[PDB]
Amino acid sequence: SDTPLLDQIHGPKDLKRLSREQLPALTEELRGEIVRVCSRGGLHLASSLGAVDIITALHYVLDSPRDRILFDVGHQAYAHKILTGRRDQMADIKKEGGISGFTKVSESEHDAITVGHASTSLTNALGMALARDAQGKDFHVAAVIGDGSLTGGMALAALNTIGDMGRKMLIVLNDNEMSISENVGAMNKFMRASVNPFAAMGVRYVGPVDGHNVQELVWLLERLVDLDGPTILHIVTTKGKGLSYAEADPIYWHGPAKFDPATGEYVPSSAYSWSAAFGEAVTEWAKTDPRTFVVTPAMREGSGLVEFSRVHPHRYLDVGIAEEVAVTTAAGMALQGMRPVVAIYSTFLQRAYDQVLHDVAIEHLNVTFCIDRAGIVGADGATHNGVFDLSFLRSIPGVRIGLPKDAAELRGMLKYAQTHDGPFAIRYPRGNTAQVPAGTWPDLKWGEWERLKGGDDVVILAGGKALDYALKAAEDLPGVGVVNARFVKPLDEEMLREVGGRARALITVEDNTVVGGFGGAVLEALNSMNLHPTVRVLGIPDEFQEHATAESVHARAGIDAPAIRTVLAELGVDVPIEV
Amino acid sequence: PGTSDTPLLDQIHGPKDLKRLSREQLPALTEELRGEIVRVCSRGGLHLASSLGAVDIITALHYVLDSPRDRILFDVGHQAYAHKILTGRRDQMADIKKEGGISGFTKVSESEHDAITVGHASTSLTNALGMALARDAQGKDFHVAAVIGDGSLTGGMALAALNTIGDMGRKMLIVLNDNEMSISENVGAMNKFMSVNPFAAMGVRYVGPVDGHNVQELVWLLERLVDLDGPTILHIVTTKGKGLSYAEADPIYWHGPAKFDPATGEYVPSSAYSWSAAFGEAVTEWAKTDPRTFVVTPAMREGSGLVEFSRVHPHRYLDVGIAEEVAVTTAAGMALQGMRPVVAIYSTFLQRAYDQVLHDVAIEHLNVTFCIDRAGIVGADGATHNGVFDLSFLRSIPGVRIGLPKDAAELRGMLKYAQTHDGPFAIRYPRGNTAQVPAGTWPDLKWGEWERLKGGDDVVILAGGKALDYALKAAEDLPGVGVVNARFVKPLDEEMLREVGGRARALITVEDNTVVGGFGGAVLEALNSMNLHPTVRVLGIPDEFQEHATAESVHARAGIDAPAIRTVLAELGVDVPI
Numbered sequence A: 001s002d003t004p005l006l007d008q009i010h011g012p013k014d015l016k017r018l019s020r021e022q023l024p025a026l027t028e029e030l031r032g033e034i035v036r037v038c039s040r041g042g043l044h045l046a047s048s049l050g051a052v053d054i055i056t057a058l059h060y061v062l063d064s065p066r067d068r069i070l071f072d073v074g075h076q077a078y079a080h081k082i083l084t085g086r087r088d089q090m091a092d093i094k095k096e097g098g099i100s101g102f103t104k105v106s107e108s109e110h111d112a113i114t115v116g117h118a119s120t121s122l123t124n125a126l127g128m129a130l131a132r133d134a135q136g137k138d139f140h141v142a143a144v145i146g147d148g149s150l151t152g153g154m155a156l157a158a159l160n161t162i163g164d165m166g167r168k169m170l171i172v173l174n175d176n177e178m179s180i181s182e183n184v185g186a187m188n189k190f191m192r193a194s195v196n197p198f199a200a201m202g203v204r205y206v207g208p209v210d211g212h213n214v215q216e217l218v219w220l221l222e223r224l225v226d227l228d229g230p231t232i233l234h235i236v237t238t239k240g241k242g243l244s245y246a247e248a249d250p251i252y253w254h255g256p257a258k259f260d261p262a263t264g265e266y267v268p269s270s271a272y273s274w275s276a277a278f279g280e281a282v283t284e285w286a287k288t289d290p291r292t293f294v295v296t297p298a299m300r301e302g303s304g305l306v307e308f309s310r311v312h313p314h315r316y317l318d319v320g321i322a323e324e325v326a327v328t329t330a331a332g333m334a335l336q337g338m339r340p341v342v343a344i345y346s347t348f349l350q351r352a353y354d355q356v357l358h359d360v361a362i363e364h365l366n367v368t369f370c371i372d373r374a375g376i377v378g379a380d381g382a383t384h385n386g387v388f389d390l391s392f393l394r395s396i397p398g399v400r401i402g403l404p405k406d407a408a409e410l411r412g413m414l415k416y417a418q419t420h421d422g423p424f425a426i427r428y429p430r431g432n433t434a435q436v437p438a439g440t441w442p443d444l445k446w447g448e449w450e451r452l453k454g455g456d457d458v459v460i461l462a463g464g465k466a467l468d469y470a471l472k473a474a475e476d477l478p479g480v481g482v483v484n485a486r487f488v489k490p491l492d493e494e495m496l497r498e499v500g501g502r503a504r505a506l507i508t509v510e511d512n513t514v515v516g517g518f519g520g521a522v523l524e525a526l527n528s529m530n531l532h533p534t535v536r537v538l539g540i541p542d543e544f545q546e547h548a549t550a551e552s553v554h555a556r557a558g559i560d561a562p563a564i565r566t567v568l569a570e571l572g573v574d575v576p577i578e579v
Numbered sequence B: 001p002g003t004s005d006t007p008l009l010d011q012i013h014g015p016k017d018l019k020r021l022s023r024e025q026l027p028a029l030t031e032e033l034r035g036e037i038v039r040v041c042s043r044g045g046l047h048l049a050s051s052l053g054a055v056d057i058i059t060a061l062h063y064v065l066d067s068p069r070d071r072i073l074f075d076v077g078h079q080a081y082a083h084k085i086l087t088g089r090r091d092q093m094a095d096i097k098k099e100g101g102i103s104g105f106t107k108v109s110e111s112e113h114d115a116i117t118v119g120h121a122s123t124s125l126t127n128a129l130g131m132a133l134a135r136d137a138q139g140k141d142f143h144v145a146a147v148i149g150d151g152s153l154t155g156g157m158a159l160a161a162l163n164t165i166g167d168m169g170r171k172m173l174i175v176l177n178d179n180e181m182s183i184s185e186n187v188g189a190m191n192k193f194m195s196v197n198p199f200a201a202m203g204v205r206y207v208g209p210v211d212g213h214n215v216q217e218l219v220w221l222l223e224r225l226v227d228l229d230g231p232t233i234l235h236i237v238t239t240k241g242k243g244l245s246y247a248e249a250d251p252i253y254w255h256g257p258a259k260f261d262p263a264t265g266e267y268v269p270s271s272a273y274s275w276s277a278a279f280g281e282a283v284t285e286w287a288k289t290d291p292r293t294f295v296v297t298p299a300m301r302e303g304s305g306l307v308e309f310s311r312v313h314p315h316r317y318l319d320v321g322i323a324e325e326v327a328v329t330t331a332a333g334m335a336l337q338g339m340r341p342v343v344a345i346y347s348t349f350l351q352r353a354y355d356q357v358l359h360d361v362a363i364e365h366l367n368v369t370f371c372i373d374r375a376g377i378v379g380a381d382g383a384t385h386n387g388v389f390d391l392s393f394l395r396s397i398p399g400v401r402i403g404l405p406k407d408a409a410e411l412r413g414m415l416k417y418a419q420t421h422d423g424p425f426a427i428r429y430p431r432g433n434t435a436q437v438p439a440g441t442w443p444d445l446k447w448g449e450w451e452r453l454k455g456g457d458d459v460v461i462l463a464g465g466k467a468l469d470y471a472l473k474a475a476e477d478l479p480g481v482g483v484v485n486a487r488f489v490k491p492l493d494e495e496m497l498r499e500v501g502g503r504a505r506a507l508i509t510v511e512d513n514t515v516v517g518g519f520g521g522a523v524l525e526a527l528n529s530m531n532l533h534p535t536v537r538v539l540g541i542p543d544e545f546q547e548h549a550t551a552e553s554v555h556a557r558a559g560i561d562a563p564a565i566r567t568v569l570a571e572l573g574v575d576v577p578i
């Protein structure tokens, strides 16, 4: 029946009924299935394909859930779900109401940690190891960490604590030489005679061994697992193993775009997108500005920096999954007269809060942040919704914050930010925007925002994604004015004083948490101006958001067009119900 | 006239004057500097032992290189007193950390000789890489040298940095200042370990370990190392407190020693009962009847008041080094396993773990409790240490609760709740003291309920923790003015806030936090969504880093102290005696 072995496994107990010599076949069955799961659309094919054999060996040897198997990032864990009672739900992975794309504690007893951000497996594994010992229990603790994740400060510091404590712990290093856009770093410790790249951490080191030989992998685990103290099993795997398209092109196949398993041919997006626009703009800027230096923390592809990396190799830098290192390395360059631009997703910028505050903001350094995936990002769910931005940057003295309405306005903010003292942050969503001509570089007074639709009475203030919704909401409402509130640090105070002084009510809309964001900046402003209009604050509630499309999350959170219209109606505006 | 005992320093106004000395005279400068720092520090709360410890390499560094052209970077900066004495600031060591004076750590706008502004650890390597890359980009050849101590190296931000530094392969000298002390004894793996190179796996040259107090022999090395291609780790071994017998004998206390006389080594015993202690006492007592409690600290056992606890409960204490990120996510891991970990951390260093708190602890609403010391303005340490953002950045995290205990009984109350209810909880408290309290004090409180502390609607002041002291004083002989212990920032006391904003002429909020996105901001959001529009005055620390002064000073000029609230009260039309 194409999957004879898998058909009889509903969990790891069913798995432990197969002989070792049956496991390679199960291994093929699992690859078949993972390919079918993903041929759907945007999911993690290659990382999971590469990890099948180790996940099989682990679940064969250890008995979860008494034993705890911890996954770093969790994107490489599809076989794990398939072997733990979730085979049917893979159909809806990352879909609203379905299971999560990563391991989630809520979801299953077998999911040890809720992960999505990288490099948290080892600190968590240590936490469990310590808790175990205090309790007087004993049960295995295995962490699966990829070579890319090993690059993070968090992984590297953790080992050093792990080695000090010297507890019973299995750490499997899943080594691909691939991150997304292929690993960097004086390879973290692998890539070194041949002995122990970790000796200085006082951790036992085994391998490298062949990470696709499931039988050899069982044998090893069985012997490694009752050893005293911490161990690194270093396994070498091929990203996208068992699909020649994925194998040959490990970067595209990390997140393929709907394909036919039989051919290797995929649906090509010809979309534009903020990422590409930022791409074009910096690639163009650095052509005339020798001081511009782009740094990404492991996200060349995700941020539209491929052409940038090819057109200015001498002004590009990939610091690995090390956001802390991105930000303060930019801080260094800025101190030496450069104009560094840190390209970073909103959730990942969270990892560098202190680096922004202490290393950049104190001395008002010249670092421009271009922040991608700002607001809800959708399918990745709680771990990735870049929904805190406008709160946490806002609190930091001297850090400027703007939201471009479009590519032209992005460019302007970029030009400006690159051309004036201090840090500037510019946030934009996952989503598309229109291409503008080469050499489009408008001047804008930073902090000034613009009227877009006439109307006092009720005035909507929003920027970026929220501004679409605002402009859609007001389409046929003559009373209702809209303002492109495109700066959040500086608010446009002259404008807000004037609008808040002579309007019945105001609405603020933000693709950000409601708490301490744009809504709050306005309230604080109005309060210092001793002004008291009716204000309705729409954004994401103070609570995390499961995976869902950005459009439902917004619909349910009350910031999409229909919702703004409902709020407008509560306010007294005549809103049609429409044919 | 020249009646000094420091003939060499008397003639050195910067690195250019120092290179006039022969290399044989260096040991003599080495010793003048030593005496100079002991005299400077006998004042009070300064960084004696670390600075003495690094006297010899700082001398050798300025002798070999030449700032400003070459770039000498210092990690943390608490060890760089010699650097300040050798760079035209010898005379203002008298006022270091004082308002209006030079800063305790390296500071960029303070001297062209200060390559980075520092206060938080582990940031040196990464700025050094940045400077190196820019220099290279610009087509220049000046030296970049960083000084990092061994505790500092414990930090993920240095460890990752080495990883990127080894990858780029650029001219750079990194001196490892290894005295196997942090503030406490340094914590290990890497400390345990130290004809093989410990950094082999990161493509960085390794020289040493070498004697770090031989100034003669450190110049020799530097002269040969500094023109090599690629990055170099120079490993030196020093003695924290070198030069001062009793500092050597006890490098934990002499790290930041009280007023002392150099001749004996006798110091003023600071017999205050601080918050740190009130914490320590409370956790020690609590862990005794609760085996699920586990206290984690990121290198701050002594500062967080955990010395006794680490001795009484060795099996429920953990010191993860200068790595806040690990402190928090180790705690997540613990709580995931039915334990009840307590992360003891200064507000300012909690910033290093914002993402860990959010993603590793908040997403699954985990049983981690944060006792946050140094909440608010810490004073003399200035901008890099004032913990004035925490009410803002925690508030934004779904499910993270925040209390400010009026006092030590209330600390115990909050600690009791957090430890016996689900989800995360953060308790923040100042530098300073409260009255001791009897053993077994464990009040029951309802999390999120404020207490009224003074009668009178009309103007109501809302303050918690340290602001509360000011609020209460301000209000003294003013019968219209009521004070609420707003002992909870998240959640707020919804009902009592609606009651008070519904009835009072005006409200004042006060907070030892930035004014942006904090308690005030939270109050304003609540009133908004309750559709209540009273006059509110929001008092706090302005959206502006605060240079070194005394808390009293910073609070004076920010307008959160008593006379300042009294002024606000007059402005709202309260009758306030002149």
Ligand SMILES: Cc1ncc(C[n+]2csc(CCOP(=O)(O)OP(=O)(O)O)c2C)c(N)n1
Pocket: A046, A047, A048, A073, A075, A076, A116, A117, A118, A145, A146, A147, A148, A149, A150, A174, A175, A176, A178, A179, A180, A239, A297, A298, A321, A348, A351
């Ligand atoms: C803190 C953080 N920054 C960036 C990312 C983006 N990211 C998601 S998966 C991935 C690659 C992880 O590399 P590796 O551990 O080698 O995974 P593998 O391709 O080997 O399966 C990255 C960089 C992330 N998940 N977390």
Ligand SMILES: Cc1ncc(C[n+]2csc(CCOP(=O)(O)OP(=O)(O)O)c2C)c(N)n1
Pocket: B050, B051, B053, B076, B078, B079, B119, B120, B121, B148, B149, B150, B151, B152, B153, B177, B179, B180, B181, B182, B183, B186, B240, B298, B299, B300, B322, B324, B349, B352
């Ligand atoms: C993020 C952070 N956490 C904690 C501190 C507190 N701290 C200041 S100095 C120091 C010890 C520094 O150790 P090391 O580099 O070995 O310097 P040494 O005392 O040996 O001179 C610590 C932990 C800090 N500066 N930054």
Ligand SMILES: [Mg+2]
Pocket: A146, A147, A148, A174, A175, A176, A177, A178, A179
């Ligand atoms: Mg990999």
Ligand SMILES: [Mg+2]
Pocket: B149, B150, B151, B177, B178, B179, B180, B181, B182
């Ligand atoms: Mg040291």
